[PDB]
Amino acid sequence: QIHLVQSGTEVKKPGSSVTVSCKAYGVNTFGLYAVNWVRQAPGQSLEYIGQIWRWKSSASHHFRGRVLISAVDLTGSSPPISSLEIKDLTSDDTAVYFCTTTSTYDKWSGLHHDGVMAFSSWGQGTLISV
Amino acid sequence: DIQMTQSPSTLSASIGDTVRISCRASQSITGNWVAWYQQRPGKAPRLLIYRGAALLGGVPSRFSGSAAGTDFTLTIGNLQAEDFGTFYCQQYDTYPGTFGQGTKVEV
Amino acid sequence: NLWVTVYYGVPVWKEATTTLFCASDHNVWATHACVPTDPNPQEMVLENVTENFNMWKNEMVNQMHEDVISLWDQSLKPCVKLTPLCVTLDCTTVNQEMKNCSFNTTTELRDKKQKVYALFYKLDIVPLSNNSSEYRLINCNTSAITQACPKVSFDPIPIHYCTPAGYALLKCNDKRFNGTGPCHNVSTVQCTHGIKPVVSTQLLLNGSLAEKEIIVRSENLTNNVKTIIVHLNKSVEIVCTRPGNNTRKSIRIGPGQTFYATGDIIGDIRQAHCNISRGDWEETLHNVRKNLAEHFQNKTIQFASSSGGDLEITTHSFNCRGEFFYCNTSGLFNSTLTITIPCRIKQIINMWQEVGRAMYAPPIAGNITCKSNITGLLLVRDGGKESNSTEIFRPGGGDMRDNWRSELYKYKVVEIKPLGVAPTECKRR
Amino acid sequence: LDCTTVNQEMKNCSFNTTTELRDKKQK
Amino acid sequence: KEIIVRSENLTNNVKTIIVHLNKSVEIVCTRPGNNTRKSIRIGPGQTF
Amino acid sequence: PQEMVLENVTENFNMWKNEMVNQMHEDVISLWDQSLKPCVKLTPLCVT
Amino acid sequence: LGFLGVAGSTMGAASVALTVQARQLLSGNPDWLPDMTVWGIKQLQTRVLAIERYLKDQQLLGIWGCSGKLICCTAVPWNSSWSNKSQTEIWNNMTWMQWDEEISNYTATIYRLLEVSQNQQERNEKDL
Amino acid sequence: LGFLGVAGSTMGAASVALTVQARQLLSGNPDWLPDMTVWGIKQLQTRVLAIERYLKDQQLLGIWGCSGKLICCTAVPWNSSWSNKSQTEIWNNMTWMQWDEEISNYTATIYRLLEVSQNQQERNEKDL
Amino acid sequence: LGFLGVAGSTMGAASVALTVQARQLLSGNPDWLPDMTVWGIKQLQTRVLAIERYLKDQQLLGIWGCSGKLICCTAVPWNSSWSNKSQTEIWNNMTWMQWDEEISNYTATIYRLLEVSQNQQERNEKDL
Ligand SMILES: *[C@@H]1O[C@H](CO)[C@@H](O[C@@H]2O[C@H](CO)[C@@H](O[C@@H]3O[C@H](CO[C@H]4O[C@H](CO[C@H]5O[C@H](CO)[C@@H](O)[C@H](O)[C@@H]5O[C@H]5O[C@H](CO)[C@@H](O)[C@H](O)[C@@H]5O)[C@@H](O)[C@H](O[C@H]5O[C@H](CO)[C@@H](O)[C@H](O)[C@@H]5O)[C@@H]4O)[C@@H](O)[C@H](O[C@H]4O[C@H](CO)[C@@H](O)[C@H](O)[C@@H]4O[C@H]4O[C@H](CO)[C@@H](O)[C@H](O)[C@@H]4O[C@H]4O[C@H](CO)[C@@H](O)[C@H](O)[C@@H]4O)[C@@H]3O)[C@H](O)[C@H]2NC(C)=O)[C@H](O)[C@H]1NC(C)=O
Ligand SMILES: *[C@@H]1O[C@H](CO)[C@@H](O[C@@H]2O[C@H](CO)[C@@H](O[C@@H]3O[C@H](CO[C@H]4O[C@H](CO)[C@@H](O)[C@H](O)[C@@H]4O)[C@@H](O)[C@H](O[C@H]4O[C@H](CO)[C@@H](O)[C@H](O)[C@@H]4O)[C@@H]3O)[C@H](O)[C@H]2NC(C)=O)[C@H](O)[C@H]1NC(C)=O
Ligand SMILES: *[C@@H]1O[C@H](CO)[C@@H](O[C@@H]2O[C@H](CO)[C@@H](O[C@@H]3O[C@H](CO)[C@@H](O)[C@H](O[C@H]4O[C@H](CO)[C@@H](O)[C@H](O)[C@@H]4O)[C@@H]3O)[C@H](O)[C@H]2NC(C)=O)[C@H](O)[C@H]1NC(C)=O
Ligand SMILES: *[C@@H]1O[C@H](CO)[C@@H](O[C@@H]2O[C@H](CO)[C@@H](O[C@@H]3O[C@H](CO)[C@@H](O)[C@H](O[C@H]4O[C@H](CO)[C@@H](O)[C@H](O)[C@@H]4O)[C@@H]3O)[C@H](O)[C@H]2NC(C)=O)[C@H](O)[C@H]1NC(C)=O
Ligand SMILES: *[C@@H]1O[C@H](CO)[C@@H](O[C@@H]2O[C@H](CO)[C@@H](O[C@@H]3O[C@H](CO)[C@@H](O)[C@H](O)[C@@H]3O)[C@H](O)[C@H]2NC(C)=O)[C@H](O)[C@H]1NC(C)=O
Ligand SMILES: *[C@@H]1O[C@H](CO)[C@@H](O[C@@H]2O[C@H](CO)[C@@H](O[C@@H]3O[C@H](CO)[C@@H](O)[C@H](O)[C@@H]3O)[C@H](O)[C@H]2NC(C)=O)[C@H](O)[C@H]1NC(C)=O
Ligand SMILES: *[C@@H]1O[C@H](CO)[C@@H](O[C@@H]2O[C@H](CO)[C@@H](O)[C@H](O)[C@H]2NC(C)=O)[C@H](O)[C@H]1NC(C)=O
Ligand SMILES: *[C@@H]1O[C@H](CO)[C@@H](O[C@@H]2O[C@H](CO)[C@@H](O)[C@H](O)[C@H]2NC(C)=O)[C@H](O)[C@H]1NC(C)=O
Ligand SMILES: *[C@@H]1O[C@H](CO)[C@@H](O[C@@H]2O[C@H](CO)[C@@H](O)[C@H](O)[C@H]2NC(C)=O)[C@H](O)[C@H]1NC(C)=O
Ligand SMILES: *[C@@H]1O[C@H](CO)[C@@H](O[C@@H]2O[C@H](CO)[C@@H](O)[C@H](O)[C@H]2NC(C)=O)[C@H](O)[C@H]1NC(C)=O
Ligand SMILES: *[C@@H]1O[C@H](CO)[C@@H](O[C@@H]2O[C@H](CO)[C@@H](O)[C@H](O)[C@H]2NC(C)=O)[C@H](O)[C@H]1NC(C)=O
Ligand SMILES: *[C@@H]1O[C@H](CO)[C@@H](O[C@@H]2O[C@H](CO)[C@@H](O)[C@H](O)[C@H]2NC(C)=O)[C@H](O)[C@H]1NC(C)=O
Ligand SMILES: *[C@@H]1O[C@H](CO)[C@@H](O)[C@H](O)[C@H]1NC(C)=O
Ligand SMILES: *[C@@H]1O[C@H](CO)[C@@H](O)[C@H](O)[C@H]1NC(C)=O
Ligand SMILES: *[C@@H]1O[C@H](CO)[C@@H](O)[C@H](O)[C@H]1NC(C)=O
Ligand SMILES: *[C@@H]1O[C@H](CO)[C@@H](O)[C@H](O)[C@H]1NC(C)=O
Ligand SMILES: *[C@@H]1O[C@H](CO)[C@@H](O)[C@H](O)[C@H]1NC(C)=O
Ligand SMILES: *[C@@H]1O[C@H](CO)[C@@H](O)[C@H](O)[C@H]1NC(C)=O
Ligand SMILES: *[C@@H]1O[C@H](CO)[C@@H](O)[C@H](O)[C@H]1NC(C)=O
Ligand SMILES: *[C@@H]1O[C@H](CO)[C@@H](O)[C@H](O)[C@H]1NC(C)=O
């Protein structure tokens, strides 16, 4: 019922910006449903890139001022959309990015805290190399 | 920041066997507030357990979780038919969150 | 060191569902089915708290719908039944919206029959054979007709839904709320504001108006079958009437059971019709169009008349002093000093979409005229990718619950847990 | 009820009864 | 364990004797026919 | 029954605005109605 | 303040004025409904359930030795494994909602402990 | 003695026999009415209302520092802007009905003062 | 041990777990039969009766100064007339049922003495 469709593989010369799109099929709105962007590089270490929650966007300390996370709500011809934008890419940013959505309506379910949360639904991930 | 460490690094297994994976945190986690995930090679991670020992739907009843003060143990009992890939322990106590290094299971 | 201490009265709430009762400040609602009371209400504004809302799974509307159906049934049952009316009707011309039909019925004595005559609308008549002059009522083979009960009034009155002890209602006060998401300005109450249980289709009538500007809400905009509710901030004036002078006859169909029907019509043949202020309607169409253009990208928006179908769902429907008007609005939603729309009326009304129950509304003696406010619209998007340039909308009915969501979307029901535990330096006991 | 043989534990019975229209009967 | 016999007054001869068994017996049975369900309109929605 | 005698009190009575009689009246009619409802009805006697 | 007025206030402030929340639990509707209604039976069900819930909470308080005390003080030590946070942090920068969520797993066992403690005390009160 | 036999007695004499009046607020309930009629609903009516009233009165007593006590000495001073009569006159030449009539305007203020005094006492106890 | 598990135990051992017996007097089923049936009326009747019985027991306890206690010392002398057995025999050889058997004729007198004793104590509380 809930699916996440992500953009395609795209490889760029170092020194430019990159955008990645996540498309939430089945999500009623990004209220009650928070979006979290995570990273997985070779080395198999899952990091935490950032999130949009309650229409507030935030990023971890390693990426503050480096990644912009934007979102547009449900429209007539398009389900809810989220987007990662990395301003500059070094050699070490090669990884697969994952979009995740988590329900935030219960307020008592164990799947989320006030700011940090687990990830109920996972997209198929976009591979980016430099 | 809160770190974690999982064990064992890798373990062999067989059909019908019961396996245990323990992740230990750098700070005792008052609430359970820990999650367990699977990841097959080339696929997307799938949430298995949240809130320490809460079982989602669709996931088989064979999985279980135990939450001590600092050590959290995932018990995958009665490995049936298809074997699994990489398992992961994650904390969501403080911001930002962090994932574990990870363990691998093989036949 | 640190010892446990239990507190009673801790302010924590869970989401919960309960049987909410109602209250009011002859009529079925006022003198039955819930208490008359309205003391000084207690409204408070919480601080530093945000609460999630989603109106599209809320038990308030289901409870209200069940209560409305149950009250109507309980009102209809304790009076006259119309089983002897289902006979062969010999109908002829009035000598064009009615037919003069004579028929045989019982009387105060079961060994004698009587010949009577009455006027009937053809929407209440079904033929028996093509080469015949026989007619029957609509619901004579599928249900049993019960007469609308003359001494009781089916007039909507304001009603307040009230929470029982141990529960509370949370109200979203955020301006321009579309029903889903967080709420940063929350208030607590015990009883809702005035709600009028008006049943209408294709046009929301006599409703509370939006606070600042038009609010557009639907359970799933991307889906097309779902209803789109439009909540205006400027009320539109619609006044309308059946002007024909009628007169009703009392027919004894048994021991004390009397059946009232359209005895005769006198005066010129005048058609029931609805007037709407034209300039205000043009303004509200423009406001709705350019507001709804926001949710649907740059594609142009067109309005078109309802598709063909049953009279109940295709035409706008309402009630006025007991008379049931089905108005054909083929010019109101026709776009891209007064506007007049035709209105047929019907007597055998089979609402609530159930089977086996149907009601007959006796005609009021004189002519009927009543004025009301259009305060909302129910629009439906047409499916299919016929064009990639324009998206066309239609009148839409569907579930009756949509008529009440617009009044109950601010409210949430919460249970209270008063017992808590916490560590403190206190030890002594 | 006008009953005849089955044409051994039942009988084939015809009867008049009411219909949708109260002023008509059916067999 | 085994069969139980009950009666609120066994020495009386007009009182039911209940026998409770420990091994259930198999009884399967049937009406083996083909009867079509004829519908008759009794009245306004009444169907026989 | 328990009956106790209030020694030093003085109470004002008014028999003409007592709700006891109205309650008794309502009970009498309601009881008679619920008694006469669950049995035979003389609808077919209304003949010539 | 008013009923549930201190939802956003921290626990230290909420410790004051618990009586409004306590008293709201028993306030009801003096009027009732006429006969032969399912509405009336639903109302009776709801209010009997409310009385039962209130009585259960009061009995649970009494078994712990806090029959008529809103802010009573028991004698059970607080295990650090339940929730190990600073006193100032708990009573100055946390609402009751977050607190009740963060100790949800350890609530039940805590209750049992309270029981035993009071029972022990009562027995000692007869053996001393 | 009887249920209200001390109605005419002055308050000093009436303070000795509060148990009978207290007990009759709950006792006297008969068996049930089998018929599901208006009468059964009215019985259920009256008895649920009685339970609610008794629980409300007991909760009002318990919020104050007077839980489980028929006679209770609080710690709120008696403002002379309320009834100002000598103790002998109050307790030897006045019935309870007259006393309740004379002080009718100040009952709400007295109740609120008792509430705040007990809350202050509880907070002080937890803080000292 | 669970509910009624200490029936065979002697009186001394049974006093350790009175809370299990006490708590089951309020546990029940929160659902309902929504069909206007006589079943619903009978269920609602039995629940209201249970509430009334529990409230009466709590009132009777409170009249004796034992409101928040499951075990309570009442300070009224034990007349040897109503029962004269050694403490060891009573607390190590007789079940509670036999005890309630052998003092059946005298419970009313004991209850009246209890209420009079607390009335005297409460009056003296303000007398001195
Ligand atoms: C029901 O009713 C509800 C209300 O009642 C209603 O809610 C409303 O929903 C809409 C959704 O449609 C909300 O509007 C959206 O809001 C989004 C969130 O915006 C917030 O965050 C941004 C980003 O902020 C970060 O960065 C800035 C940079 O300066 C910092 O200042 C911030 O602090 C923050 O930085 C932190 O976090 C970073 C990580 O992200 C860290 O790196 C960093 O270090 C920091 O830690 C803010 O800028 C926003 O503020 C704006 O508004 C305030 C208001 O005061 C202004 O002061 C401020 O200047 C800003 O203007 C806000 O805080 C937005 O992302 C979203 O924006 C998109 O849409 C708009 C409108 O169309 C576009 O103009 C905009 O360009 C965005 O479009 C881009 O993204 C989409 C995504 O799909 C693309 O498709 C699109 O093409 C475009 O992409 C292009 O740009 C990309 C870069 O941006 C680029 O990468 C792409 O490649 C491409 O080129 C939109 O505004 C609205 O707020 C809600 N209303 C509320 C909350 O009241 C709800 O919808 C209703 N429901 C329905 C069904 O209708
Ligand atoms: C949206 O909201 C509007 C609110 O105005 C509704 O319109 C009102 O509807 C009510 C009910 O249909 C109307 O009230 C009725 O008016 C009748 C005509 O009143 C005229 O005639 C009487 C004769 O004495 C004059 O006194 C009066 O001043 C008017 O000149 C009355 O005859 C009705 O009486 C009812 O109650 C008496 C009580 O004894 C009964 O005996 C009657 O049989 C009858 O049941 C009643 O008063 C009211 O006039 C309407 N207002 C307007 C401005 O039109 C809309 O109906 C509503 N829309 C929807 C869809 O619900
Ligand atoms: C609101 O209405 C819209 C329709 O107007 C609705 O959108 C639909 O959602 C479903 C559910 O996600 C979509 O179906 C999926 O679409 C993706 C798109 O790539 C497909 O990949 C999916 O197929 C895969 O997954 C299936 C199992 O889910 C497998 O069986 C399959 O083999 C594939 O592996 C799946 O078909 C559907 O496409 C959209 N439709 C449109 C037009 O967007 C939305 O869900 C509604 N919102 C709510 C809250 O109900
Ligand atoms: C179970 O059913 C059996 C019957 O199959 C039943 O047994 C009968 O019990 C009655 C009990 O009264 C017996 O009647 C008595 O028999 C004795 C035998 O000597 C007579 O002396 C009695 O006569 C005296 O009492 C009479 C009043 O009852 C006086 O009128 C009379 O003058 C004497 O004072 C009396 O007739 C009867 O004989 C037996 N029958 C058999 C066949 O056993 C048994 O009681 C039932 N069990 C229960 C628990 O009910
Ligand atoms: C800490 O408390 C939480 C909250 O109770 C515990 O999570 C709970 O875990 C149980 C067992 O996994 C869940 O029960 C399951 O519910 C699902 C619902 O679909 C059902 O399908 C299963 O059959 C099973 O009954 C329970 O729902 C879940 N609670 C919530 C709110 O989700 C958690 O286990 C506790 N941690 C401990 C005790 O260590
Ligand atoms: C509906 O049809 C019935 C049956 O035809 C009409 O009833 C009858 O109508 C005729 C024609 O108006 C009446 O005849 C007139 O009678 C007067 C009596 O003084 C006579 O002087 C006239 O010359 C004329 O013949 C007849 O009385 C009347 N009968 C009854 C029982 O009503 C009825 O009028 C029709 N309704 C309408 C609205 O047309
Ligand atoms: C938050 O919501 C409250 C409740 O609606 C608002 O307070 C009301 O404001 C209106 C006018 O704006 C007054 O007429 C009412 O008397 C107010 N009621 C109360 C209880 O204060 C408040 O203005 C809103 N605040 C914001 C920032 O939106
Ligand atoms: C009802 O809401 C509409 C929608 O906003 C209001 O129309 C606005 O009118 C002002 C007039 O100064 C224009 O500047 C805006 O552009 C209009 N908005 C739109 C979306 O067209 C209208 O004024 C409101 N009416 C009332 C009485 O509140
Ligand atoms: C509804 O509007 C119509 C149109 O103005 C009104 O009917 C007109 O009435 C005047 C005099 O009453 C006549 O001269 C016109 O010929 C009528 N026009 C039509 C098209 O019928 C009607 O009176 C209005 N009704 C109400 C209740 O306001
Ligand atoms: C409502 O009325 C409109 C016109 O008043 C009807 O539309 C007409 O439909 C016929 C065919 O049935 C066409 O020949 C006409 O050209 C249409 N009118 C116009 C102005 O184009 C409509 O069918 C009616 N709908 C109902 C349900 O009665
Ligand atoms: C059911 O109960 C009967 C007793 O009525 C059992 O039959 C007995 O079996 C034993 C075998 O050890 C014999 O010694 C007895 O003579 C039998 N009794 C009779 C009356 O024949 C029987 O085995 C039981 N069956 C089960 C499945 O429990
Ligand atoms: C009941 O048992 C009878 C006897 O075996 C079954 O009837 C026989 O069915 C077979 C074929 O299934 C025929 O060849 C025999 O001629 C039948 N004999 C009689 C006497 O009927 C019958 O089918 C069984 N029914 C069920 C439901 O088990
Ligand atoms: C219709 O709207 C006007 C405009 O404010 C208002 O005065 C009137 O009370 C409204 N009538 C109804 C029935 O809502
Ligand atoms: C709109 O109305 C005009 C005139 O009233 C008519 O010619 C036209 O066909 C109508 N269009 C629709 C779509 O009903
Ligand atoms: C009937 O019409 C007349 C004028 O034709 C009008 O004055 C009267 O108000 C109408 N009846 C009603 C009930 O409005
Ligand atoms: C019973 O009659 C139906 C009528 O269509 C037929 O399909 C079915 O096979 C018959 N059954 C037997 C057992 O003959
Ligand atoms: C809300 O928070 C602010 C600062 O966080 C504080 O000053 C204010 O007193 C709080 N309001 C309440 C009702 O606690
Ligand atoms: C009634 O008043 C008289 C007046 O002297 C007094 O003696 C008597 O005791 C009073 N009765 C009661 C019951 O107080
Ligand atoms: C109360 O009465 C006393 C008499 O004992 C008097 O001295 C005092 O002034 C009075 N107080 C007020 C406020 O009237
Ligand atoms: C039952 O009685 C025996 C005495 O032989 C005793 O040992 C045992 O503990 C008793 N059991 C219980 C549950 O009191």
Three-state SS string over chain C comes to CCEEEEEEEEEEEEECCCCCEEEECCCCCCCCCCEECCCCCCCEECCCCCEEEECCCCHHHHHHHHHHHHHHHHHHCCCCECCCCCCCEEEECCCCCEEEEEEEEECCCCCCEEEEEEEEEHHHEEECCCCCCCEEEHHHCCCEEEECCCCCCCCCCCEEEECCCCEEEEEECCCCCCCEEEECCEEEECECCCECCCCCECCEECCCCCCCCCEEECCCCCCCCCCEEEEEEEEEEEEEEECCEEEEEEEECCCCCEEEEEEEEECCCCCCEEEEEHHHHHHHHHHHHHHHHHHCCCCEEEECCCCCCCHHHHCEEEEECCEEEEECCCCCCCECCEEEEEEEEECEECCCCCCCEEEECCCCCCCEEEEEEEEEEEEEECCCCCCCCEEEEEECCCCCCHHHHHHHCCEEEEEEEEEEEEEECCCCC
**Are I122 and H71 an interchain contact pair (Cβ–Cβ within 8 Å)?**
yes
Taking the C-alpha atoms of residue C171 and residue C410, their distance in angstroms, rounded to an integer, is 5
Cβ(A32)–Cβ(C181) under 8 Å? yes
Taking the C-alpha atoms of residue H16 and residue A63, their distance in angstroms, rounded to an integer, is 79
Q: Quick one: which of A119, A113, A104, A108 has its CA closest to A37?
A: A119
Q: Which of residues 30-69 of G touch H (CB under 8 A)?
A: 30, 32, 35-36, 40-41, 44, 47-48, 51, 54-55, 67-69
3-class SS of residue E26:
coil
In this structure, which amino acid lies at residue H41?
A: I
Domains of chain B are: 4-105 (2.60.40.10)
Taking the C-alpha atoms of residue H124 and residue C428, their distance in angstroms, rounded to an integer, is 13
Taking the C-alpha atoms of residue G99 and residue G11, their distance in angstroms, rounded to an integer, is 9
C-alpha distances (whole Å) from I116 to each of C95, C275, H70, I51 are 95, 82, 13, 27
Phi and psi torsions of C350, nearest 5°: -115, 85
For ligand 5, residues with CB inside 6 Å are A 109-110; B 32, 51-55, 57, 67; G 104-105
- Name the DSSP letter for residue E41: B
Q: Quick one: which of A96, A39, A43, A22 has its CA closest to B42?
A: A96
Total residue count of chain G as it appears in this document:
128
Q: Residue with structure tokens 């007295």?
A: H110
CB atoms within 10 A of CB A102: 20
Cβ(A73)–Cβ(C221) under 8 Å? no
**Are C83 and D23 an interchain contact pair (Cβ–Cβ within 8 Å)?**
no
If phi over 0 gives left and psi between -120 and 50 gives alpha, with beta otherwise, what is residue C356?
Answer: left
Phi and psi torsions of A64, nearest 5°: -65, 130
Taking the C-alpha atoms of residue G101 and residue G81, their distance in angstroms, rounded to an integer, is 15
Q: Which helix (H) or strand (E) holds F22?
A: helix F19-36
Cβ(A67)–Cβ(A88) under 8 Å? no
Neighbouring residues of A25: CB distance < 8 A, sequence distance ≥ 6: A2, A3, A4, A5, A79
The strands making up A81-86's β-sheet, listed across from edge to edge, are: A3-6, A18-25, A81-86, A67-72
Taking the C-alpha atoms of residue A84 and residue C66, their distance in angstroms, rounded to an integer, is 47
Query: How far does the centroid of ligand 12 lie from the alpha carbon of residue E32, in Å?
Result: 11
Please state the separation of Cα C252 from the chain's center in Å: 33
Taking the C-alpha atoms of residue B59 and residue B66, their distance in angstroms, rounded to an integer, is 17
The CA R_g of chain H, rounded to the nearest whole Å, is 19
Taking the C-alpha atoms of residue F23 and residue G6, their distance in angstroms, rounded to an integer, is 47
Q: How many domains does chain A contain in total?
A: 1
- Name the DSSP letter for residue B96: S
Q: Which chains touch I (3 or more CB pairs under 8 A)?
A: G, H
Q: Which helix (H) or strand (E) holds D2?
A: strand D2-4
Tokens of B99: 């994932």
Beta strands in A3-45 (DSSP E): 3-6, 18-25, 33-40
CA distance C145 to chain E (A): 9
Beta bridge partners of B74: B21, B65
First to last CA, chain B: 36
Q: Which of residues 31-60 of C touch G (CB under 8 A)?
A: 32-37, 42, 44, 46-49
Q: Residue with structure tokens 């219909």?
A: D19
State the ligand closest to the CA atom of C316: 10
Query: How far does the centroid of ligand 12 lie from the alpha carbon of residue E19, in Å?
Result: 30
Taking the C-alpha atoms of residue C86 and residue C139, their distance in angstroms, rounded to an integer, is 9
Angle at G46 between CA G44 and CA G51, to 5 degrees: 95
**Are E45 and C143 an interchain contact pair (Cβ–Cβ within 8 Å)?**
yes
Q: Quick one: which of B29, A103, H61, H2 has its CA closest to G106?
A: B29
Q: What is the DSSP code string of B27-69? A: S--SS--EEEEEE-TTS--EEEEETTTEE-SSS-TTEEEEE-S
Sign of CA dihedral G47, G49, G55, G60: negative
Query: How far does the centroid of ligand 7 lie from the alpha carbon of residue C184, in Å?
Result: 12
Taking the C-alpha atoms of residue I53 and residue I57, their distance in angstroms, rounded to an integer, is 6
Q: What is the DSSP code string of chain I? A: --TTTTSSS-HHHHGGGHHHHHHTTT--------S--HHHHHHHHHHHHHHHHHHHHHHHHHTTT-TT-SS--------TTT----HHHHHHH--HHHHHHHTGGGHHHHHHHHHHHHHHHHHHHHH-
CB atoms within 10 A of CB C375: 22
Structural domain of A70: 3-128
Tokens of C115: 């010949």
Can you give the three-state secondary structure of chain G, one letter per residue?
A: CCCCCCCCCCHHHHCCCHHHHHHHCCCCCCCCCCCCCHHHHHHHHHHHHHHHHHHHHHHHHHHCCCCCCCCCCCCCECCCCCCCCCHHHHHHCCCHHHHHHHCCCCHHHHHHHHHHHHHHHHHHHHHC
For helices H38-63 and H107-127, give the axis angle rounded to 10 degrees.
60
For helices H38-63 and I38-62, give the axis angle rounded to 10 degrees.
30
- Give the CATH number, domain containing residue A90: 2.60.40.10
Please state the separation of Cα G58 from the chain's center in Å: 8
Please state the separation of Cα E42 from the chain's center in Å: 31
Taking the C-alpha atoms of residue I109 and residue I83, their distance in angstroms, rounded to an integer, is 13
Total residue count of chain H as it appears in this document:
128
Query: How far does the centroid of ligand 12 lie from the alpha carbon of residue E30, in Å?
Result: 11
* Chain H residues whose beta carbon lies within 8 Å of the beta carbon of residue C5: 126
Taking the C-alpha atoms of residue H114 and residue C293, their distance in angstroms, rounded to an integer, is 61
Total residue count of chain A as it appears in this document:
130
Cβ(C284)–Cβ(C335) under 8 Å? no
Taking the C-alpha atoms of residue C301 and residue C293, their distance in angstroms, rounded to an integer, is 7
C-alpha distances (whole Å) from B107 to each of B60, C323, H71 are 20, 78, 78
CB atoms within 10 A of CB I49: 14
CB atoms within 10 A of CB H85: 12
Taking the C-alpha atoms of residue F35 and residue F32, their distance in angstroms, rounded to an integer, is 5
Taking the C-alpha atoms of residue C74 and residue G70, their distance in angstroms, rounded to an integer, is 47
H28 contacts chain I (CB < 8 A): no
Taking the C-alpha atoms of residue A10 and residue A95, their distance in angstroms, rounded to an integer, is 11
Q: Quick one: which of I47, I50, I8, I6 has its CA closest to I25?
A: I50
- Name the DSSP letter for residue A25: E
Strands C390-395 and C300-303: parallel
Cβ(F9)–Cβ(H14) under 8 Å? no
Method: cryo-EM
If phi over 0 gives left and psi between -120 and 50 gives alpha, with beta otherwise, what is residue B70?
Answer: alpha
Q: What is the DSSP code string of H10-54? A: -HHHHTT-HHHHHHHTT--------S-SHHHHHHHHHHHHHHHHH
Taking the C-alpha atoms of residue C9 and residue G71, their distance in angstroms, rounded to an integer, is 9
Taking the C-alpha atoms of residue H93 and residue H80, their distance in angstroms, rounded to an integer, is 19
Whether the CB of H88 sits within 6 Å of ligand 19: no
3-class SS of residue B106:
strand
Cβ(C57)–Cβ(C104) under 8 Å? no
Q: Residue with structure tokens 């006792």?
A: H27
Q: Which helix (H) or strand (E) holds H55?
A: helix H38-63
The CA R_g of chain B, rounded to the nearest whole Å, is 13
Q: Which own/partner pairs from C60-63 qualify as long-range (CB within 8 Å, at least 24 positions apart)?
A: C60/C20, C60/C161, C60/C408, C60/C411, C60/C413, C61/C401, C61/C404, C61/C405, C61/C408, C62/C401, C63/C19, C63/C20
CB atoms within 10 A of CB F24: 9
If phi over 0 gives left and psi between -120 and 50 gives alpha, with beta otherwise, what is residue C241?
Answer: beta
Taking the C-alpha atoms of residue A47 and residue A66, their distance in angstroms, rounded to an integer, is 15
Cβ(C379)–Cβ(C289) under 8 Å? no
Torsion of Cα atoms, C282 then C286 then C292 then C297, to 10°: 140
Beta bridge partners of C247: C264
Beta bridge partners of C205: C374
**Are A108 and G98 an interchain contact pair (Cβ–Cβ within 8 Å)?**
no
Q: What is the resolution of this structure in A?
A: 3.5
Beta bridge partners of B35: B90
Taking the C-alpha atoms of residue B72 and residue B85, their distance in angstroms, rounded to an integer, is 19
Q: Quick one: which of C379, C417, C373 has its CA closest to C396?
A: C379
Neighbouring residues of G8: CB distance < 8 A, sequence distance ≥ 6: C46, C47, C48, C49, G95
Q: Is I51 exposed, middle or buried (0-12, 13-18, 19+ CB in 10 A)?
A: buried
Q: Quick one: which of C56, C8, C50, C46 has its CA closest to C402?
A: C56
Cβ(B72)–Cβ(B23) under 8 Å? yes
Of all atoms in ligand 13, which is nearest to the CA of residue C207? 14
Q: Is H49 exposed, middle or buried (0-12, 13-18, 19+ CB in 10 A)?
A: middle
Strands A126-128 and D25-26: unpaired
For helices C59-76 and G38-63, give the axis angle rounded to 10 degrees.
140
Query: How far does the centroid of ligand 2 lie from the alpha carbon of residue C321, in Å?
Result: 7
Q: Is G25 exposed, middle or buried (0-12, 13-18, 19+ CB in 10 A)?
A: buried
Taking the C-alpha atoms of residue G107 and residue C216, their distance in angstroms, rounded to an integer, is 44
3-class SS of residue A18:
strand
If phi over 0 gives left and psi between -120 and 50 gives alpha, with beta otherwise, what is residue B9?
Answer: alpha
Taking the C-alpha atoms of residue B79 and residue B17, their distance in angstroms, rounded to an integer, is 5
Cβ(D19)–Cβ(E41) under 8 Å? yes
3-class SS of residue A119:
coil
Taking the C-alpha atoms of residue G4 and residue G8, their distance in angstroms, rounded to an integer, is 9
Q: Quick one: which of C62, C98, C390 has its CA closest to C270?
A: C98
Neighbouring residues of C225: CB distance < 8 A, sequence distance ≥ 6: C380, C383
Torsion of Cα atoms, C336 then C342 then C348 then C349, to 10°: 30
State the ligand closest to the CA atom of C93: 6
Cβ(C423)–Cβ(C3) under 8 Å? yes
- Name the DSSP letter for residue A91: G
Neighbouring residues of G69: CB distance < 8 A, sequence distance ≥ 6: H67, H122
3-class SS of residue H57:
helix
Cβ(A80)–Cβ(A74) under 8 Å? yes
Number of C-alpha atoms within 13 angstroms, CB side, residue B66? 10
